[model samples]
Target chain A: SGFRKMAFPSGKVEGCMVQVTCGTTTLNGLWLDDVVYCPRHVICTSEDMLNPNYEDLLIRKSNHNFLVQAGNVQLRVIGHSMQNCVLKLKVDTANPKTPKYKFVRIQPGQTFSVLACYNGSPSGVYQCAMRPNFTIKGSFLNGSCGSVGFNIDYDCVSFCYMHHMELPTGVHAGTDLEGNFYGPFVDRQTAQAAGTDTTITVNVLAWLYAAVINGDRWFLNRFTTTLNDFNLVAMKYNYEPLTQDHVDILGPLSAQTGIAVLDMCASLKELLQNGMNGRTILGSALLEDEFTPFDVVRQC
Target chain B: SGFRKMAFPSGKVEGCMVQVTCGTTTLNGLWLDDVVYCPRHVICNPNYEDLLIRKSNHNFLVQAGNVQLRVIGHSMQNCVLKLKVDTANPKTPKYKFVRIQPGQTFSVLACYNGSPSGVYQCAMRPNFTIKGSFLNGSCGSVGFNIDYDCVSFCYMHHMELPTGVHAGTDLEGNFYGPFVDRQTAQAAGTDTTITVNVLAWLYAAVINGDRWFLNRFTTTLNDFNLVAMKYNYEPLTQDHVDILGPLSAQTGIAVLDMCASLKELLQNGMNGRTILGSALLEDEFTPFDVVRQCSGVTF
Candidate 1:
């Protein structure tokens, strides 16, 4: 039933199951012909499904495991040697102090996704041990039996939290929101004490809101409710006062698509009110979607 | 032969030394008719003479004939006034005018622009000579021969003037005081005890008073219009003194001493320097003061 025969200029060819996100609708294994129509608006698919190589076709396997990796890695089925298995690939090292990319293996037909968060924070260039330009040199594949390797350099924004992230003046974080080793720091406590925490949170929200409104494929695919810690960290930064429109647009987006933008807004609002009344809301409240952690004043 | 007769609506009388100011240009002995045009910016002459009154930063040392007038006030300009240079003859006896002895208390309607507009009782040091007929608002028929070296303490909120010369009103209709009630005990002797309200507001024109105020008081802009009173003396509570009279028949001009006034309940002791209410007389204050002095030109 899933098999489909298409007559190409060369001959009749069998197409494999493919999932592509175009516009806002994600066509999952729907039809190869229908997905290729909107290439400009096509958010993403695993390995350029429109122009697929015979060896790179994703096939059914014994296990239906989903794979997730850093946006820097590009996965190819490698002649069906891999299966339809979920493979969680390492994007960044566990310790930011010693930033080194952790390579993973992908068998023939494995499907994988990219993550922007690592260890409860937005993934940074420093964490991934990548250059400011995001030109990844070594293979993300750990010398697996198959010829699995990452091709094509990633845009610096592949690791960034927002599509249009900016660092403070004279701060050279390149495009990464979490910054590189040298740093354009995003210190939450310093911002609050200096009365600029509101502006930072608002700016972060503004970037997310823009991404939602513009329907950026990469951002929508990368950020999700499961990675809500990134939202919590981003919200710690603020005081451009949020308007009703911000809530109206973001609140519905959070409900419709499981993004934690709305939750972050609510948490930040409570934190601000408590701060004004001289109430010390601890950092743990951020975990429960209540307040930011007073303990975690992570820099850069 | 140079003078020509000009007609007026009332009658064709010979125009005496009429001078006027127009557009920052002063036309002295120029002509009477050339003055009336541009009446909007016409900040006119005092008693009809375009006299060049030299001004210091905060004082106007004005001299008209033998009568030397020390006009002390903040930037005062653009208006008409009459200075009766009465140093020529002395008809009124010295006993008729109120003689405020050294260390004696006196009262004056210290009207200012901000907050609670009222008068206060002030005292003069022995160095400053203030002899004038004591009345509610009049500088008196024989205006006070207030020496250039005298800054009396006219602070301590007296009764509010229901129809007194307020902010916008000219100083002509109503007059403040230099009234020294000799009957009081503090009036006879000097009390060196610095009171709680002594850091009220200081008066300027008393020769060395400005220097003395600059030395002792807080000089911050916020404390600009305030001064500490010297001795713990009581204000004149008499009701008749509260009723304001005309400035004076001879000198029908309001002379605001370019001095600060204390009008608030201070929070701390003299050391703390904590102040509470309105401390400055705003821009609309009238320029001239009697034997007192004033400075600058503010329209």
Candidate 2:
């Protein structure tokens, strides 16, 4: 077969790095497409099946860095060229200053598919560019600390005020999160169709339940504060509360989408139990999935 | 004289192209600045600690380019500047309602449609009692995002309601305390009040506070509707009292002064009102309950 055209795993396709999960696995990485066979005993063949530019997708950050193949869902930083060939690499993990970095000797035409943990503690804007090099310009990938400075500032202003990205149509691991750079910011109608009520009710709560299953105190506390904001926002729209049974129905759905908080040892047990009423007074129309990073506050 | 710094007409800064007014007349085009040496060519001596190689580099005209650079010595419209001291707002450039204290100055920039344009100051509203030098401007182009940074002058804001009114509700039935608008706030200067036809949402001419509440502590808005408490409830926790301490916090219709003596004539029992809640005398809060509840109960 000559270059079998690949299709978007999800029925939808819009964003840069679209993701889908075929059962328990995320299909946005290496396993997305099938590999083609190469020429074996090549004494009679000058014709190989490799395209001059083998890479298909591109993520244009500060500059261009071609990804040969997505080996794992995790990205590998293959150092291309260094300015003045400075072996020093300044890596800013979420923190803009006091850059958490190291010294690595890199020469012309050499690199690595190395792993940097962005999914772990303290995520956001993992900036790794060759500092003290020439012109001081390199690129960063949103591997885990996806957005660098797409967050808060003193004026209470955020990138949501300036640069905004289109929201995902389908609910996913990233979409259901509140502080996660990408979110499932859907309208009320869209929310209900996705098997939930509010952005927090369906999408965000899904992420919350995921945290619950992971026993992640960080995300649990974060979603708790975010959900409270809706308590206030919902009143703006004048909402009637969801009955206790309505809330009860959501408990199991969280379990089916992969992970969730067990009824026995749930996190934020005090607030979730007392704070949530037999009625849901806080629900509002988020008007189209028009939201920004500034609207959310994430930790680590 | 080592480059005597000529001051800007108004105190405003941060807008790319700017204009200024002295008194009755507005100044725009090739009238001021950059004349280098006009009042009879005076001194020489290239002993410079200068601003630029361009004329005296007086910025009279403005060219709107580098947003990174404001007040370029050029012109796109050559728009004249009008200094409006005593002005009313809700106008275009559609400036947000700004507050100037008894002794403070407030400045604003203007824009042209989609393009950020010149400032407007043909007149000022009657409330602008004090006038200071006009000046300059902002970054985040928040066209009309409702935000406030008030510290004092509670009367200057649209936060307070007309007197005698106890509680209110939004279009969606989410109740709040003593709320109105700039028109009424100014007309009421201090008298607080609105009218509604939600017979179920209202009682006689009074707002039914009892039927709208879920409990004494929490509120219909899901968060503590403190504004509702300040008006409907008489005995306030010190925490509730402290929440009202800010003279000018930009809460949408802030309830003014929470004290027992300040309670208005409590209205009748709007018990049958469904918009409030399904009648838990404690569930649907009203003035009747407040009157009976405060009859010696501290907690």
Candidate 3:
């Protein structure tokens, strides 16, 4: 029981003005899909007084009409939804056959916006709708289309940056402990490098920040799941939980995921404080972060 | 108007749903100077879910409970409304207080002050009127406690290195460490002299991620083979990776200002074995096997 020719205008309108029932049986109110302005409008008993003698305004009397500003329209599709929706969009030049179609899906709250430059009195309409699998719809506002995306790696559940692999493994250098251990940790110095290099736009540092401090899986799932996710754990680098038998089997891979790399930029003062051996052995401008309550935390 | 026989249950049950209303001119309600959940009552409305209310210690001598009607008046009571009994002996009190002023209830973060740890809820019960909207409570100090265990070096670095050793796999694959307990590959009817090879030293700079090893290379292979290479080569320098697993990993060696050191003798290993080096030309030694060895001391 749906009908056309009841098309409403494109601008904002009040819910009270758009009647849900058009006087009921004969020719009732417009059946609008969404309410606008204020769905919870109510008259407070305190302030508003009833006026017995008032005439209805022209805009109020005509339930059949409202106003829409006739200018080049803009499409701002914000998509930071929890269930994750994909938007399929294309521009209609008001012509039948356009050349190319871009296949795209946006997850999370990365809003997709297309600024119509050619909309300078450009004819036709812009369209975008549809679902994840369908991936395209046509909402025509202007005849222009464009946008930016969180282009994640196909296999990686990516957002901003990236995940780094350090040790194909680790073995004893000088530490009393001697054995082969794999490293998933990436130093901040290395992470920042990977972020800047054009070939690797992976936000490795962002990934580290999420994994170390927040244990946020939202970002880490862009790489590995079980190895990366601890159900939002922020504590680190401890294998005391792993038993010897399982430890043997897990080996280097276990070490890689658990440990993270840190960047320490020091100055002359710190080296002076490190004793002469440290002055001789350490770089003057190496570790910058001074000892804190959290140094004990990062040492792991 | 006050009497007793009124003990209450410690939980939420609906059909057991209660609500707040003006003392009925034409009605009535739970008259509850109190309430609680059967604690998992889902049918309870989110708006009036709070079973208790906390009022101010600041409000001049006004103190009462869940249903304490103030003496001979519609007197408002601002007191700590609490649960009647210890139904579960749960770890947390999970106490909450009502905010009638704004029609809401708030959960507070609490801590323990003593050894057995008594629940010290930071109470700041603001009244519902324009007058009682105060947030400053008698309790001031909060939140400096840590749920984290980054208190010691061992606890901190424990995540990186599994202390002790595993000689049983490469050496046998069984666990042993600190080199002293390494009887895995010792000489003279024993096994502990870890063959200080080129790959061993390479792995050192990477896994021993301590920043102290940065800037210059600390060669474990302090043999004369290094001195021969040093004597023959003038423009030879290798950058030591200040590791934590390769920070800003510099591949294809940069023009380094650092020096080579395969000459410094270190440690006495296996048995009275002091530092020994056969600078490559003197023997049919490979840089792979002829670097340096340490078995008795802590590096």
Best by TM-score: 2
* Candidate number achieving the greatest DockQ relative to the actual structure: 2
Error of 2 at B132 (Å): 26
The better candidate by lDDT, 1 or 2, is 1
lDDT of 2 at B141: 11
Off by over 4 Å in 1: A1-172, A176-238, A243-245, A253-271, A275-283, A286-300, B1-299
Displacement of the residue A201 alpha carbon in candidate 2, Å: 4.0
Model 1 chain B scores worst on lDDT over the 10 consecutive residues at B1-10
How does candidate 3 score on lDDT?
A: 0.18
DockQ of 1: 0.00
Candidate 1 lDDT over residue span B170-226, tens digit each: 122111233221222222123232221122122211221222222222233223322
Evaluate candidate 1 by giving its C-alpha RMSD to the native, one decimal: 36.8
True contacts kept of each: 0.00, 0.00, 0.00
DockQ of 3: 0.01
Residue-by-residue lDDT tens digits, candidate 3, A136-164: 21111211111111121211211111101
Identify the runs in model 2 with alpha carbons over 4 angstroms from their true place. Answer: A1-199, A202-270, A276-300, B1-299
Candidate 1 residue lDDT tens string, A229-253? 4345445543433445445545544
Report every candidate's CA lDDT: 0.22, 0.21, 0.18
Candidates 1 and 3, the one with greater TM-score: 3
TM for candidate 1 is: 0.14
- List the candidates' TM-scores in order: 0.14, 0.20, 0.16
